[PDB]
Design a protein around this ligand. Structure first.
Ligand SMILES: CC(C)C[C@H](CC(=O)NO)C(=O)N[C@H](C(=O)N[C@@H](C)C(=O)NCCN)C(C)(C)C
Ligand SMILES: [Zn+2]
Length: 258
Protein backbone atom coordinates (compact mmCIF):
# COMPACT_ATOMS: atom_id res chain seq x y z
CA UNK A 1 0.00 0.00 0.00
CA UNK A 2 1.41 3.36 -1.11
CA UNK A 3 1.23 5.47 2.09
CA UNK A 4 1.41 8.48 -0.22
CA UNK A 5 -1.79 7.41 -1.92
CA UNK A 6 -3.97 5.50 0.51
CA UNK A 7 -6.78 7.94 1.31
CA UNK A 8 -9.94 8.73 -0.65
CA UNK A 9 -10.65 12.43 0.04
CA UNK A 10 -14.34 13.35 0.25
CA UNK A 11 -16.52 16.30 -0.52
CA UNK A 12 -19.31 15.90 2.05
CA UNK A 13 -22.49 17.88 1.46
CA UNK A 14 -25.19 18.46 4.09
CA UNK A 15 -28.40 19.68 2.46
CA UNK A 16 -30.89 22.08 4.12
CA UNK A 17 -32.94 19.16 5.47
CA UNK A 18 -29.93 17.63 7.18
CA UNK A 19 -28.85 21.06 8.49
CA UNK A 20 -32.25 21.74 10.03
CA UNK A 21 -33.15 18.28 11.28
CA UNK A 22 -29.83 16.76 12.25
CA UNK A 23 -27.86 19.97 12.66
CA UNK A 24 -30.46 21.82 14.75
CA UNK A 25 -29.90 24.68 12.34
CA UNK A 26 -26.30 25.01 13.51
CA UNK A 27 -23.05 24.67 11.56
CA UNK A 28 -21.10 23.22 14.52
CA UNK A 29 -23.67 20.52 15.28
CA UNK A 30 -23.91 19.65 11.59
CA UNK A 31 -20.19 19.34 10.97
CA UNK A 32 -19.43 17.53 14.25
CA UNK A 33 -21.98 14.84 13.37
CA UNK A 34 -20.43 14.30 9.94
CA UNK A 35 -16.82 14.50 11.05
CA UNK A 36 -17.45 11.87 13.73
CA UNK A 37 -19.43 9.61 11.39
CA UNK A 38 -16.76 9.61 8.66
CA UNK A 39 -14.00 8.95 11.21
CA UNK A 40 -15.87 5.90 12.55
CA UNK A 41 -16.52 4.66 9.00
CA UNK A 42 -12.84 5.31 8.24
CA UNK A 43 -11.91 3.01 11.15
CA UNK A 44 -13.79 0.19 9.42
CA UNK A 45 -12.07 0.75 6.09
CA UNK A 46 -8.58 1.46 7.42
CA UNK A 47 -8.55 -1.77 9.47
CA UNK A 48 -9.76 -3.92 6.59
CA UNK A 49 -7.21 -6.21 4.95
CA UNK A 50 -8.46 -6.29 1.33
CA UNK A 51 -6.25 -9.29 0.46
CA UNK A 52 -6.46 -10.81 3.95
CA UNK A 53 -2.79 -9.93 4.40
CA UNK A 54 -0.90 -6.65 4.55
CA UNK A 55 -3.03 -4.74 2.07
CA UNK A 56 -4.74 -2.55 4.64
CA UNK A 57 -4.57 1.05 5.76
CA UNK A 58 -6.79 2.39 2.96
CA UNK A 59 -9.48 4.80 4.08
CA UNK A 60 -11.42 8.01 3.70
CA UNK A 61 -10.99 11.55 4.95
CA UNK A 62 -13.11 14.66 4.55
CA UNK A 63 -11.59 17.38 2.36
CA UNK A 64 -14.48 19.81 2.55
CA UNK A 65 -17.92 19.96 4.06
CA UNK A 66 -20.42 22.05 2.12
CA UNK A 67 -23.29 23.17 4.36
CA UNK A 68 -26.49 24.25 2.68
CA UNK A 69 -28.43 26.21 5.31
CA UNK A 70 -31.54 26.99 3.26
CA UNK A 71 -33.24 25.45 0.25
CA UNK A 72 -31.99 26.26 -3.24
CA UNK A 73 -34.49 28.62 -4.86
CA UNK A 74 -35.41 27.40 -8.34
CA UNK A 75 -37.30 28.86 -11.30
CA UNK A 76 -40.53 27.10 -12.30
CA UNK A 77 -39.67 23.86 -14.09
CA UNK A 78 -36.08 23.83 -12.84
CA UNK A 79 -34.83 21.34 -10.24
CA UNK A 80 -31.88 21.12 -7.84
CA UNK A 81 -31.00 18.49 -5.23
CA UNK A 82 -31.24 21.08 -2.47
CA UNK A 83 -34.58 22.58 -3.56
CA UNK A 84 -37.41 22.70 -0.98
CA UNK A 85 -39.79 20.37 -2.77
CA UNK A 86 -39.44 16.61 -3.23
CA UNK A 87 -39.24 15.35 -6.81
CA UNK A 88 -40.99 13.86 -8.80
CA UNK A 89 -43.82 13.90 -6.27
CA UNK A 90 -43.98 17.10 -4.24
CA UNK A 91 -46.60 15.57 -1.97
CA UNK A 92 -44.09 13.03 -0.61
CA UNK A 93 -41.57 13.64 2.17
CA UNK A 94 -38.72 12.55 -0.07
CA UNK A 95 -37.46 12.45 -3.63
CA UNK A 96 -37.36 9.22 -5.58
CA UNK A 97 -33.87 8.11 -4.38
CA UNK A 98 -32.43 7.26 -7.79
CA UNK A 99 -33.49 10.60 -9.24
CA UNK A 100 -32.01 12.38 -6.23
CA UNK A 101 -28.60 10.71 -6.65
CA UNK A 102 -28.68 11.61 -10.39
CA UNK A 103 -29.64 15.21 -9.60
CA UNK A 104 -26.96 15.58 -6.91
CA UNK A 105 -24.30 14.28 -9.33
CA UNK A 106 -25.46 16.74 -11.98
CA UNK A 107 -25.46 19.78 -9.69
CA UNK A 108 -22.14 18.90 -8.05
CA UNK A 109 -20.28 17.88 -11.22
CA UNK A 110 -17.68 20.65 -11.15
CA UNK A 111 -16.73 19.87 -7.55
CA UNK A 112 -16.93 16.09 -7.98
CA UNK A 113 -14.38 16.17 -10.79
CA UNK A 114 -11.75 17.29 -8.27
CA UNK A 115 -12.26 14.77 -5.47
CA UNK A 116 -12.11 11.03 -4.99
CA UNK A 117 -15.83 10.97 -3.92
CA UNK A 118 -18.73 13.31 -3.17
CA UNK A 119 -21.38 12.19 -0.67
CA UNK A 120 -24.72 13.81 0.10
CA UNK A 121 -26.18 13.61 3.62
CA UNK A 122 -29.87 14.35 3.75
CA UNK A 123 -32.91 13.91 6.00
CA UNK A 124 -35.89 12.67 4.01
CA UNK A 125 -38.00 9.53 4.34
CA UNK A 126 -37.41 7.58 1.14
CA UNK A 127 -40.24 5.22 0.27
CA UNK A 128 -40.23 1.66 1.55
CA UNK A 129 -37.37 1.87 4.04
CA UNK A 130 -34.57 2.91 1.67
CA UNK A 131 -31.63 4.54 3.48
CA UNK A 132 -29.07 5.32 0.79
CA UNK A 133 -27.78 4.79 -2.76
CA UNK A 134 -24.43 5.00 -4.57
CA UNK A 135 -22.78 4.41 -7.94
CA UNK A 136 -20.31 1.56 -8.34
CA UNK A 137 -20.71 -2.06 -7.30
CA UNK A 138 -23.94 -2.61 -9.21
CA UNK A 139 -24.60 -5.79 -11.25
CA UNK A 140 -26.90 -3.90 -13.62
CA UNK A 141 -25.81 -3.99 -17.25
CA UNK A 142 -23.72 -0.99 -18.28
CA UNK A 143 -23.69 0.45 -14.75
CA UNK A 144 -20.47 2.20 -13.60
CA UNK A 145 -19.11 4.60 -10.98
CA UNK A 146 -17.46 4.76 -7.60
CA UNK A 147 -14.10 6.06 -6.38
CA UNK A 148 -12.34 8.53 -8.74
CA UNK A 149 -14.49 10.69 -11.02
CA UNK A 150 -15.67 8.86 -14.12
CA UNK A 151 -17.53 10.94 -16.66
CA UNK A 152 -20.97 10.15 -18.00
CA UNK A 153 -22.42 12.41 -20.69
CA UNK A 154 -26.02 13.02 -19.68
CA UNK A 155 -28.10 13.38 -22.83
CA UNK A 156 -30.83 15.05 -20.76
CA UNK A 157 -28.47 17.24 -18.73
CA UNK A 158 -26.40 18.12 -21.83
CA UNK A 159 -23.06 17.98 -19.95
CA UNK A 160 -20.75 15.48 -18.32
CA UNK A 161 -21.55 14.55 -14.73
CA UNK A 162 -19.35 12.23 -12.63
CA UNK A 163 -20.21 8.87 -11.09
CA UNK A 164 -18.09 9.18 -7.97
CA UNK A 165 -21.10 9.86 -5.73
CA UNK A 166 -23.56 8.45 -3.19
CA UNK A 167 -26.01 9.55 -0.55
CA UNK A 168 -27.20 8.77 2.96
CA UNK A 169 -30.44 9.75 4.64
CA UNK A 170 -30.61 9.69 8.47
CA UNK A 171 -34.40 9.63 8.50
CA UNK A 172 -36.39 6.42 8.08
CA UNK A 173 -40.02 5.66 9.00
CA UNK A 174 -40.62 9.08 10.53
CA UNK A 175 -37.70 9.03 12.94
CA UNK A 176 -33.99 9.85 13.10
CA UNK A 177 -32.04 6.59 12.74
CA UNK A 178 -29.51 5.59 15.47
CA UNK A 179 -25.96 6.80 14.92
CA UNK A 180 -24.94 3.12 14.90
CA UNK A 181 -27.37 2.59 12.01
CA UNK A 182 -26.23 5.76 10.18
CA UNK A 183 -22.62 4.62 10.33
CA UNK A 184 -23.66 1.39 8.62
CA UNK A 185 -25.59 3.14 5.85
CA UNK A 186 -22.63 5.31 4.87
CA UNK A 187 -20.26 2.35 5.16
CA UNK A 188 -22.52 0.36 2.78
CA UNK A 189 -22.84 3.14 0.18
CA UNK A 190 -19.09 3.90 0.19
CA UNK A 191 -18.68 0.11 -0.09
CA UNK A 192 -20.46 0.23 -3.46
CA UNK A 193 -18.24 3.23 -4.31
CA UNK A 194 -15.16 1.12 -3.48
CA UNK A 195 -16.45 -1.64 -5.79
CA UNK A 196 -18.49 -4.05 -3.67
CA UNK A 197 -21.78 -5.59 -4.75
CA UNK A 198 -24.48 -6.88 -2.41
CA UNK A 199 -23.55 -10.09 -0.54
CA UNK A 200 -25.70 -13.03 -1.80
CA UNK A 201 -27.59 -15.54 0.36
CA UNK A 202 -26.13 -18.18 -1.96
CA UNK A 203 -22.67 -17.85 -0.44
CA UNK A 204 -22.95 -18.63 3.28
CA UNK A 205 -19.40 -17.39 3.84
CA UNK A 206 -20.55 -13.89 2.79
CA UNK A 207 -24.03 -14.06 4.33
CA UNK A 208 -23.83 -15.90 7.69
CA UNK A 209 -26.77 -16.91 9.83
CA UNK A 210 -27.43 -14.93 13.01
CA UNK A 211 -25.63 -17.45 15.22
CA UNK A 212 -22.52 -17.22 13.02
CA UNK A 213 -22.21 -13.47 13.58
CA UNK A 214 -25.00 -12.32 11.28
CA UNK A 215 -24.71 -10.49 7.98
CA UNK A 216 -21.88 -8.31 6.71
CA UNK A 217 -22.16 -4.63 5.73
CA UNK A 218 -22.95 -5.18 2.04
CA UNK A 219 -26.03 -7.34 2.71
CA UNK A 220 -28.99 -5.85 0.76
CA UNK A 221 -31.25 -5.66 3.84
CA UNK A 222 -30.38 -3.24 6.64
CA UNK A 223 -29.87 -4.26 10.27
CA UNK A 224 -29.35 -2.23 13.47
CA UNK A 225 -25.79 -3.52 13.73
CA UNK A 226 -25.82 -5.40 17.01
CA UNK A 227 -24.51 -8.59 15.36
CA UNK A 228 -20.77 -9.21 15.12
CA UNK A 229 -20.37 -9.12 11.34
CA UNK A 230 -22.63 -6.11 10.75
CA UNK A 231 -19.77 -3.60 10.81
CA UNK A 232 -17.34 -5.63 8.70
CA UNK A 233 -16.90 -6.36 4.99
CA UNK A 234 -17.44 -9.97 3.86
CA UNK A 235 -14.79 -11.90 1.95
CA UNK A 236 -16.96 -11.32 -1.13
CA UNK A 237 -16.78 -7.56 -0.69
CA UNK A 238 -13.05 -7.68 -0.01
CA UNK A 239 -12.44 -9.71 -3.22
CA UNK A 240 -14.43 -7.29 -5.38
CA UNK A 241 -12.91 -4.16 -3.87
CA UNK A 242 -9.40 -5.64 -4.12
CA UNK A 243 -9.61 -6.12 -7.89
CA UNK A 244 -9.37 -2.35 -8.41
CA UNK A 245 -8.47 -0.66 -5.14
CA UNK A 246 -4.73 -0.33 -5.89
CA UNK A 247 -5.37 0.90 -9.42
CA UNK A 248 -7.97 3.40 -8.20
CA UNK A 249 -5.61 4.45 -5.42
CA UNK A 250 -2.90 5.33 -7.93
CA UNK A 251 -5.52 7.26 -9.91
CA UNK A 252 -7.02 9.52 -7.24
CA UNK A 253 -6.12 8.58 -3.65
CA UNK A 254 -3.93 10.93 -1.64
CA UNK A 255 -1.85 11.05 1.49
CA UNK A 256 -3.69 10.81 4.79
CA UNK A 257 -3.70 14.12 6.67
CA UNK A 258 -2.73 13.59 10.31
C1 LIG B 1 -27.68 0.52 4.27
C2 LIG B 1 -28.73 -0.29 3.48
C3 LIG B 1 -28.41 -1.80 3.48
C4 LIG B 1 -28.98 0.29 2.07
C5 LIG B 1 -30.16 -0.31 1.25
C6 LIG B 1 -30.24 0.15 -0.22
C7 LIG B 1 -28.92 -0.06 -0.96
O1 LIG B 1 -28.58 -1.19 -1.29
N1 LIG B 1 -28.15 1.02 -1.07
O2 LIG B 1 -26.86 0.81 -1.59
C8 LIG B 1 -31.52 -0.10 1.92
O3 LIG B 1 -31.97 1.04 1.99
N2 LIG B 1 -32.19 -1.18 2.34
C9 LIG B 1 -33.58 -1.17 2.78
C10 LIG B 1 -33.70 -1.72 4.22
O4 LIG B 1 -33.27 -2.86 4.46
N3 LIG B 1 -34.31 -0.97 5.15
C11 LIG B 1 -34.72 -1.48 6.45
C12 LIG B 1 -34.42 -0.41 7.50
C13 LIG B 1 -36.25 -1.75 6.46
O5 LIG B 1 -37.03 -0.93 6.00
N4 LIG B 1 -36.64 -2.92 6.99
C14 LIG B 1 -38.03 -3.37 7.11
C15 LIG B 1 -38.87 -2.94 5.90
N5 LIG B 1 -39.51 -4.09 5.29
C16 LIG B 1 -34.47 -1.97 1.77
C17 LIG B 1 -34.47 -1.34 0.37
C18 LIG B 1 -34.00 -3.45 1.65
C19 LIG B 1 -35.92 -2.02 2.31
ZN1 LIG C 1 -26.59 -1.34 -1.61
Amino acid sequence: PDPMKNTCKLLVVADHRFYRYMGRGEESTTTNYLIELIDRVDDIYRNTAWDNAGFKGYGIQIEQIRILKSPQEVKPGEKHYNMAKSYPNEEKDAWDVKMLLEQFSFDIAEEASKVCLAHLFTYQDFDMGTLGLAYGGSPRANSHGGVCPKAYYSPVGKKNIYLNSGLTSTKNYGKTILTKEADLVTTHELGHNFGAEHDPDGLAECAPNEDQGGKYVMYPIAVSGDHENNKMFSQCSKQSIYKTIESKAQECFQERSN
